[PDB]
Design a protein around this nucleic acid. Structure first.
Ligand SMILES: [Zn+2]
Ligand SMILES: [Zn+2]
Ligand SMILES: [Zn+2]
Length: 1241
RNA sequence: GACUUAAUGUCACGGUACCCAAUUUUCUGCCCC
């Protein structure tokens, strides 16, 4: 007669679904599948407010299952009271739910046939001989009656909305044999923190089974998908502002910038509110004069930074992280607007009793530990703007994917993903099993599915609520080796090193060897490193969790069952159990001392361990490494264009993120590098479609219909504390082809890691290889690794100027050694250019020649529409590496413009810039970008290409660009073709095929002493005024003379021998003091070339070594005769793809002499024994400028100077009378500026 | 007490949001009426 009230509390996020009805439930698959979940009925008319509840029938079913288990445990008797076998068969209505399950059954000891006068306690709780059945509720005639389990005070008197209690989520069924999810389904996952308690009542009319009912209530463990214990007692305004910002950006034709702006705002949550409050955003280039290219865009008449500040001051009421997240989400949604399968399972009537053998014992095992992540994990989730549980649309893939976080933003590992990973690991360990089939009427007898019906895990959430970091992926176009437009993706990943609590329970008659094998596989003790692949980006190594601190405790459900009900099996109190002494364990629970080691288990030693084999190596980089973090450089206040990539690493010991970010090369970059290497080696790269392709690259790297067999990891930098300045500031500039000066606002900054040839960066990374590869694929992997070793694919960005050039690879000794089984005289040019001109046979005259002359070569350019691709190594085209020596004939000046006070002489004379010679980690070297433009300009004029870096929009005193011939304008796209010089070194939209390495210093005199005068072995250079494009174009009728080249002379001795005249008299603070090196040094730089044609290699080798008595001009101070480098090729190496896998072979002098001769045939072909280049009219003019008179012809010493204006130095070659039409007409001086070595007297 | 459950039968802890993508190509820190 007594009424029992029951309290139901959940310790996991439970699932709830719409209640609908029973008759109308069949019309909705979501409610039909979720009959074991909590229900939800709407209260209002707008489908926004309702009350959740749990039906009493589900709790009754759980109680019946608990009763069956308890009675079976104690040999069919409870407290000395025997029980019958029950009755679960009906036929003639029928129950609304059918069993379709094995019912635990009993043997004997029933008193008699159960009638409605002596019903056993099992019959009392089962409600067999009651007055009410399946007809209707009618009255409370039930001997046992379960009422609805409504919510509690958490509901409150406010009609709680569904959005406040539940959050929709999508779960998959991942195919084991392939790796791609077959189908998905939706559910609503309520939270257990606030709305996890349900209250109900249980009515008993017969007191014969009170003890059994209470014991069953204690024994109930799972309900509605969550572990439970039963006890007896401003987006709208943000969206509008985001669309206003998008419209303002569109008014400036900058819609593509909206994506990067949204991503930057989203990433801004990592930085504090002081970034916007104190204006800590980058200030942009000062020389640009237009402000930052993004943060200074005028939105409705106001700067973007000020607009963001106003938005923060107006919407700070919702915190900082939420504000930035909402703004980024709204901007991304507006940008996207402007631009599988759902299978909810299914719905015999066979009674299947199961009688366990007599005398057997049943025990429950508890495994507790920590799932410490070893790589940045990622648990995917649909877009929050699309979840909206309750308001889902019916029937444009997203390019931005978030991560799974709970209501407190704590990182979460759902028990769904953990259970799926455990299921697949058990499947691998067992060697058999079935793909999970839904809707079956029978329980499959699989070796895995039997074990997974008794294993229960727990939802785990970290104690870390910091925002996740965003990782970027790009799709390189194979044809042009550039970034494909509209191929940007971003994944939010968590930090590396978080610890998630891990709880596992197994209730069986014996602990299986396969489950223990899986546990030892997951555990990371000594040399195991952990292999619990948890997450959703395994192909790039995101989520290799490692079980730690494993503690196994064993119950005893035969004699110590009463303690199990009394303590509720330690459900929800596992965290305390993990870190408590064994002397305080609850009675009936003992530690498991029979847990075998990893080497003692057979399934682990055979099936689980050799599935994934790691390959680890330390990549040595002997050059700057710039990974070009694209959003961090847009947020950090350093005001730099490109910075190196860095990570955030969690530290368990300090329970916080490491204060120093870890520099590394992205695992995505590693994967792309090896994928490109393998694709180009095997020729499968560049194929039209990979929809159903089964090529080698698709086989060993996965496609849309499969999963990759190789998983990569990050390239962490270990050699990081041996530099004392890890990253060096290197800045470049674009030089006009006509004036010869900088292109005004064209400078860009780079901040890469300071890798040095003698102090190289050491990056240590690894990748896992799945078992089952044949010999061919392992050979392909080893070949790709060897290609990476030989420096074919430079790491990072700016690989064409010598950034991230690999110097070697040292594989790990333990395990990669198995795959380790698969892994003449110097060239001389004898061409002597006559170049006699005026200076020759004029020793006693001592004429004066203008320092710079203009090379005119017409307006005829041949553009090739058959652009050579980078998809594959073409057989007929050459590819290899040039190793050449650079020797200086005049003092060379390469200023280290990073620090304008390298000599620290600004104290005495402020405003006087002081640079040093370029050096990385204290050793002198020449930048590869300075050699690139030094050879490109020579090669562009040699092949009569266009003015690639010409600067238009400058007027006279109809713009220089307008005056230039239309054929010589820079090549914009690939539609019209590319110039001969624009096709080797490449332009935008086409990566160049020639890469120039850094020029280290090897031998020769160290510095220029300059005894006396200058203290710090330097030369105080004269004033270097900006070039004036008015002496060459006096009138509008005159056209652009063409390229500008500087004569070769040793006039720097005037600067050196009169140093006291410059720095003391005249030119107070507009000069420059730089360290210089004396003539006679040697520099070794490698020019890697790829897929060059037959004559393109001859032109290159002719450009590097034009012959005797010809040299190039390099470095600052060219008009003064500074930096006349003499490049000689030491050895040419050329490899080729072949079946025999022949290594790199160095071509002899005969091939080089043949290569150059074939290159000469191209030049004469375009115009229309040993070659004589001085026959072509334009080459003859070019080689006169590069002719050096003082190399061997010692008697020559031309006087090369700029004429003074007046009254400065006239000791008649003065600008006072040189532009006057009376003395020298305009048509004459232009002709005098075009012919090299024309004496101006 | 209804808005919410039928009762001699609820493996939904019966299902990883899983697979595909090099942050990147090009640019000499240059220089005279
Ligand atoms: Zn009975
Ligand atoms: Zn099965
Ligand atoms: Zn061109």
């Amino acid at each position: 007669d007594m009424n029992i009230t029951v309290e139901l509390t959940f310790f996991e996020p439970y699932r709830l679904v719409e209640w609908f009805d029973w008759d109308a439930r069949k019309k909705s698959h979501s409610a039909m599948r979720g009959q074991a979940f909590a229900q939800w009925t709407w209260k209002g008319k707008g489908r926004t407010a309702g009350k959740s509840f749990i039906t009493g029938t589900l709790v009754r079913s759980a109680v019946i299952k608990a009763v069956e288990e308890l009675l079976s445990l104690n040999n069919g008797k409870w407290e000395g009271v025997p029980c019958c076998n029950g009755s679960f068969q009906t036929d003639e209505k029928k129950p609304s739910f059918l069993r379709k399950r094995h019912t635990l059954q009993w043997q004997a000891n029933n008193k008699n046939i159960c009638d409605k006068e002596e019903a056993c306690p099992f019959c009392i709780l089962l409600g067999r001989f009651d007055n009410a059945g399946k007809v209707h509720e009618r009255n409370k005639d039930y001997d046992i009656h379960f009422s609805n389990f409504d919510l509690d005070h958490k509901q409150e008197k406010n009609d709680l909305r569904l959005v406040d209690i539940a959050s929709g989520r999508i779960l998959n069924r991942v195919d084991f044999d392939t790796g791609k999810a077959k189908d998905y389904f939706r559910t609503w996952e309520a939270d257990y923190e606030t709305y996890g308690t349900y209250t109900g009542r249980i009515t008993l009319r017969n007191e014969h089974a009170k003890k059994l009912l209470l014991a069953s209530l204690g024994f109930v463990d799972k309900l509605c998908g969550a572990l439970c214990r039963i006890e007896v007692i401003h987006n709208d305004e943000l969206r509008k502002q985001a669309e206003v910002i998008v419209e303002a950006f569109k008014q400036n034709d900058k819609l593509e910038k909206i994506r990067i702006l949204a991503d930057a705002i989203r990433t801004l949550r990592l930085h504090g509110e002081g970034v916007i409050e104190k204006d800590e955003l980058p200030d942009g280039k000062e020389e640009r004069d237009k402000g930052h290219h993004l943060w200074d865009i005028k939105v409705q008449g106001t700067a973007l930074r000020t607009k963001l500040k106003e938005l923060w001051q107006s919407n700070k009421d919702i915190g900082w992280r939420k504000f930035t997240e909402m703004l980024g989400s709204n901007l991304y949604l507006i940008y996207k607007k402007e631009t599988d399968t759902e299978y909810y399972s299914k719905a015999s009537d066979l009674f299947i009793p199961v009688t366990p053998p007599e005398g057997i014992e049943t025990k429950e095992w508890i495994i507790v530990g920590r799932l410490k992540a070893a790589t940045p994990f990622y648990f995917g989730v649909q877009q929050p703007s699309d979840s909206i549980p309750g308001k889902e649309k019916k029937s444009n893939e997203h390019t931005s994917f978030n991560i799974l976080l709970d209501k407190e933003n704590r990182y979460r590992i759902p028990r769904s993903a953990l259970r799926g990973a455990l299921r697949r690991d058990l499947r691998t360990a067992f060697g058999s099993g079935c793909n999970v089939s839904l809707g079956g009427q029978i329980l499959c007898n699989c070796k895995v599915c039997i074990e997974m019906r008794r294993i229960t895990l727990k939802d785990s959430v970290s104690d870390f609520s910091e925002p996740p970091e965003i990782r970027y992926r790009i799709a390189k176009n194979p044809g042009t080796a550039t970034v494909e437009d509209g191929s940007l993706f971003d994944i939010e990943v968590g930090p590396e090193g978080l610890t998630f609590p891990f709880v596992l329970r197994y209730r069986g008659h014996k602990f299986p060897e396969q489950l223990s094998s899986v546990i030892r596989y997951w555990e990371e003790n000594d040399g195991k490193n952990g292999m619990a692949w948890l997450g959703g980006l395994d192909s790039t190594g995101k989520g290799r969790f490692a079980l730690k601190d494993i503690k196994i405790f064993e119950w005893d459900l035969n004699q110590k069952i009463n303690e199990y009900i009394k303590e509720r099996g330690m459900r929800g109190k596992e965290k305390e159990l993990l870190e408590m002494g064994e002397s305080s364990l609850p009675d009936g629970l003992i530690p498991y001392k029979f847990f075998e080691e990893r080497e003692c288990l057979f399934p682990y030693k055979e099936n689980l361990k050799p599935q994934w084999s790691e390959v680890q190596y330390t990549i040595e980089v002997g050059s700057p490494l710039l990974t070009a973090d694209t959003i961090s450089a847009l947020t950090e206040p350093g005001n730099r264009d490109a910075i190196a990539y860095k990570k955030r690493v969690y530290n368990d010991g300090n329970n916080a993120i490491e204060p120093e970010p870890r520099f590394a090369v992205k695992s995505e970059t590693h994967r792309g590098i090896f994928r490109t290497a393998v694709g180009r080696r095997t020729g499968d790269l560049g194929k039209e479609d990979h929809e159903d392709c089964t090529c080698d690259m698709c086989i060993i790297f996965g496609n849309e219909h499969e999963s990759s067999k190789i998983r990569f990891e990050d390239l962490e930098l270990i050699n990081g504390n041996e530099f004392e300045k890890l990253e060096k500031h290197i800045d470049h500039v674009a030089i006009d082809r006509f004036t010869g000066g900088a292109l005004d606002k064209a400078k860009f900054d780079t901040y890469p890691l300071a890798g040095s040839p003698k102090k190289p960066l050491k990056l240590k990374g690894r990748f896992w290889i799945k078992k089952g590869f044949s010999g061919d694929h392992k050979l392909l992997i080893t070949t790709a690794l060897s290609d990476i070793r030989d420096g074919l694919y430079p790491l990072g960005s700016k690989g064409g100027v010598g950034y991230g050039w690999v110097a070697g690879i040292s594989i790990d000794d333990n395990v990669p050694d198995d795959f380790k089984e698969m892994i003449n005289g110097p060239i001389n040019n004898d061409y002597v250019h006559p170049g006699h001109q005026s200076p020759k046979q004029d020793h006693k005259n001592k004429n004066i020649y203008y320092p710079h002359y203009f090379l005119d070569s017409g307006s005829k350019v041949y553009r090739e529409k058959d652009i050579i691709t980078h998809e594959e190594f073409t057989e007929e085209l050459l590819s290899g590496k040039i190793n050449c020596k650079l020797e200086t004939l005049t003092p060379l000046i390469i200023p280290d413009t990073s620090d304008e006070n390298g000599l620290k002489l600004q104290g005495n004379k402020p405003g006087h810039k002081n640079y040093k010679f370029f050096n990385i980690n204290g050793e002198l070297m020449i930048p590869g970008s300075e050699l690139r433009g030094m050879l490109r300009t020579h090669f562009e004029a040699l092949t009569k290409s266009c003015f690639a870096i010409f600067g238009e929009d400058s007027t006279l005193s109809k713009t220089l660009g307008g005056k230039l011939d239309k054929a010589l304008h820079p090549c914009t796209g690939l539609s019209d073709g590319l110039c001969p010089g624009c096709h080797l070194f490449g332009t935008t939209d086409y990566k160049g095929r020639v890469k120039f390495g850094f020029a280290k210093y090897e031998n020769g005199p160290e510095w220029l002493i300059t005894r006396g005068n200058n203290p710090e072995r330097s030369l105080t250079l004269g004033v270097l005024e900006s070039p004036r494009p008015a002496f060459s174009i006096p009138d509008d009728e005159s056209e652009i003379p063409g390229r500008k080249f500087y004569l070769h002379h040793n006039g720097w001795r005037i600067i050196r021998q009169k140093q006291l005249e410059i720095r003391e008299t005249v030119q107070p603070e507009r000069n420059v003091t730089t360290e210089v090196m004396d003539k006679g040094n040697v520099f070794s730089f490698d020019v890697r070339f790829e897929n060059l044609r037959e004559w393109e290699l001859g032109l290159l080798l002719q450009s590097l070594d034009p012959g005797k008595n010809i040299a190039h001009k390099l470095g600052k101070g060219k008009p003064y005769g500074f930096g006349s480098v003499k490049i000689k090729i030491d050895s040419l190496h050329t490899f080729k793809i072949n079946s025999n896998n022949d290594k790199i072979k160095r071509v002899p002098q005969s091939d080089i002499r043949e290569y150059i001769n074939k290159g000469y045939q191209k030049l004469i072909e375009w115009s229309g024994v040993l070659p004589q280049w001085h026959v072509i009219p334009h080459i003859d003019k070019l080689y006169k400028l590069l002719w050096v008179p003082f190399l061997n012809d010692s008697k020559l010493e031309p006087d090369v100077r700029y004429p003074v204006l007046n009254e400065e130095s006239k000791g008649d070659y003065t600008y006072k009378k040189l532009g006057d039409k009376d003395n020298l007409p305009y048509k004459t001086r232009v002709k005098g500026l075009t012919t090299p070595w024309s004496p101006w007297n």
